[PDB]
Amino acid sequence: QFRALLFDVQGTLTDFRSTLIEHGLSILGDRVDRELWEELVDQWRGCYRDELDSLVKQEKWRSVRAVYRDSLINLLAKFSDSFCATSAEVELLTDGWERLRSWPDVPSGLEQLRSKYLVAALTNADFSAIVNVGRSAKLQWDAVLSAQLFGAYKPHRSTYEGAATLLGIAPSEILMVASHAYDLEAAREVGAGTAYVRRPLQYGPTGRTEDVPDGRFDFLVDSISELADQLGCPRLG
Amino acid sequence: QFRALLFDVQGTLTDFRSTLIEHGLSILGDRVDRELWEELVDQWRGCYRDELDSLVKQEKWRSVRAVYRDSLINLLAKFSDSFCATSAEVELLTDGWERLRSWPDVPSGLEQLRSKYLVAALTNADFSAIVNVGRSAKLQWDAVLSAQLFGAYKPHRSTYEGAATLLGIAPSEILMVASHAYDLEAAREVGAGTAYVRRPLQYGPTGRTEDVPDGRFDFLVDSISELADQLGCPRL
């Protein structure tokens, strides 16, 4: 039934939280303790989601890198007592979102899926970010699709359907793979299949995760490889 | 100086002629001689090029698959005394353009380049076509860019510049890689580096060769691996 798997990347395929924590700490060093920087990372993603939530409501697209940067600048103002960052460091910190490392299952998972499916990124991240993430996260796609291509973020239907259009397939032939229910629900609305990837450490060792029940989505897996097995993709050697 | 190599794919990386000849012969079987099908394949590409020139002149974008299909249909009418195709075979024949096999240097050449460069396809083919060709030609990209993304075909500046902007890199940090002078000349006009890949068999043995001397483009190579070597990429 499915011709292509479209993947959310951040969190779903990538441990963005570990990346952004280690990245900030590498850049800022002694200037912020791990505990405070983790807090910042969490608020940063939170500001990002709030801005994207806003932009989706406004049916507007803007550079997600600019979203991360503006959110970071707003957050550095909030924490200006604790530490500061130069504009150069703001850019280097914001680069962290394009340095996401993948979960260990993901490369072999993606490779396994490719025997039977096209695999494409469908990310709200700017096109250049997902391309960069491809390198840090060792993601090799048939296609990289970004909100930037459609002028709209997920969950807007034009992303999934524009992905379907670009891939020359029906939305019903897309299996959306995400570790965020909103993404799957929105893909479902255009008729795509839904594959939920549990990422219990996505928000850290004490992070609160969606408790997706079986039967909510077409697939519910702990790894891309397990998804690949359930789609009948031959195992890798 | 280059952060990304942007590749034309058809001809540059793929032996489309051999692909389309073998593909058509597979589909049509006894119905067509190799010599006739070769001629049609060459005329088909020419109809595509003519129609693409029209659309480019005409500042419109159209599905390139539809361009191939429509031109094939027109060619089948011209060749109707010799053989026929059903509509299903028209689709299957048209699919050959999405089944391009690469020249043998290309996959390892692309792999050698990735150590230092982002490698992206920038094709006039539809997005789904180049994705499909990624499978048939074993092309693994950092990014797949199509004229379809830009509503304009190469050589239009919005393709190279859209590619640059999408990749988040200056055009001058793009090395455009193509086996067609027009593509490199247009990429040059937006500031991209130029690498001409000679493909002497691109149009088969009797094909006419572009007058591309050394120094006309930044690089002049016979393989993607050779380009990789000249760009300082270690062998894998």
Numbering used by the authors:
A (entry chain B): 11 to 247
B (entry chain A): 11 to 246
Q: What do the authors say?
A:
Microbial epoxide hydrolases, cis-epoxysuccinate hydrolases (CESHs), have been utilized for commercial production of enantiomerically pure L(+)- and D(−)-tartaric acids for decades. All these three CESH[L]s exhibit high sequence identity (>60%) with L-2-haloacid dehalogenases, which are members of the haloacid dehalogenase (HAD)-like superfamily. Studies have shown that both RhCESH[L] and KlCESH[L] adopt a two-step catalytic reaction mechanism by 18O-labeling studies.
